[PDB]
């Protein structure tokens, strides 16, 4: 239940690069402000979404 | 100044131009046919033969279903294989193997006699075996042997 020999840097690098990989979220520019917002989410900059106000963005 | 190299000569494989040789196997003996094929494939008939690289020609075998054997081999020679599962050892006599795959005996023999490794596998890629007396590589004008 313990490593038998230290793995090679190749194997460690391969495993690390494959696992620690985060995927980009999709985007779609807001119809109101033109910001690039996450697709299917309220715009975090102007608050509109499909031409409807839902937030009141502060500071 | 220039020096006359008195060293062994190596010919660049991009200046060697591979031909195709037709070999008939009718009424010949399996081992002899395979030996001839291996000698041609390996490049051992050219003055600049080299085991490093692939410099020999290609071979088309026709009439592969008419190779003759001697002795009781037709009834007794066994071709084994293992599925890697436990107990999964399957044998196949020459008769049955020939009927199911007419080209199998000669392909197996040539594969055994060729060298081993990436170049050996490539050499076996350089070989075409046909059961009948006709082949589809008419576009290459193969030289008969």
């Amino acid at each position: 239940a313990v490593p038998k020999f230290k793995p090679s840097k190749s194997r460690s690098r391969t495993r690390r690069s494959i696992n620690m990989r985060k995927k980009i979220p999709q985007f779609q520019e807001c119809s109101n402000c033109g910001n690039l917002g996450v697709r299917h989410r309220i715009c975090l900059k102007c608050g509109y979404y499909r031409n409807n106000q839902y937030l009141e963005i502060g500071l | 100044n220039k020096i006359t190299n008195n060293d062994t000569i190596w010919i660049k494989p991009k200046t060697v131009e591979k031909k195709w040789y037709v070999i008939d196997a009718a009424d010949r003996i399996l081992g002899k046919v395979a030996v001839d094929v291996v000698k041609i494939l390996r490049g051992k008939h050219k003055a600049y033969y080299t085991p490093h690289q692939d410099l020999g020609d290609n071979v088309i075998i026709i009439n592969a279903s008419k190779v003759k054997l001697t002795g009781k081999k037709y009834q007794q020679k066994l071709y084994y294989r293992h599925s890697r599962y436990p107990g999964g050892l399957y044998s196949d006599t020459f008769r049955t193997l020939s009927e199911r795959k007419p080209c199998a005996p000669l392909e197996i023999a040539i594969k055994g006699m060729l060298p081993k490794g990436p170049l050996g596998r490539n050499l076996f890629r350089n070989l075409k075996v046909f059961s009948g007396s006709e082949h589809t590589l008419k576009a290459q004008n193969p030289i008969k042997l």
């Binding site: 690390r16 620690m20 990989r21 985060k22 980009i24 979220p25 985007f27 910001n35 690039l36 917002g37 996450v38 975090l44 | -």
Partner: protein
Amino acid sequence: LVNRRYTAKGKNLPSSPKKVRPIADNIRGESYIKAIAVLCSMPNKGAKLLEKVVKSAASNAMYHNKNLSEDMIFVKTVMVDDGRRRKKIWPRARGRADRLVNRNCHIFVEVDEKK
């Protein structure tokens, strides 16, 4: 190689380089707008740290080159090195103690005018 007029550097930031490098990979070579959007969206500590450094680098470039707006800039290079470490103790059973390393990272971003 660096046009050190156009770059930002953030030293000893509170995250591990192993955790910040993938986020850097996702924005290397992208346009500034796309990279800023990605870093704002993605909810990672490394994402926020890169956001600050990238915004600062773009600010420096703009300040020194007044005719360069937010949409001619692309993130040319991004480097994430490892920084100081601090060791603290995590005590376990039977009087056994283990040392519990905390890693920091350096972040270097250079922007450049787009193709």
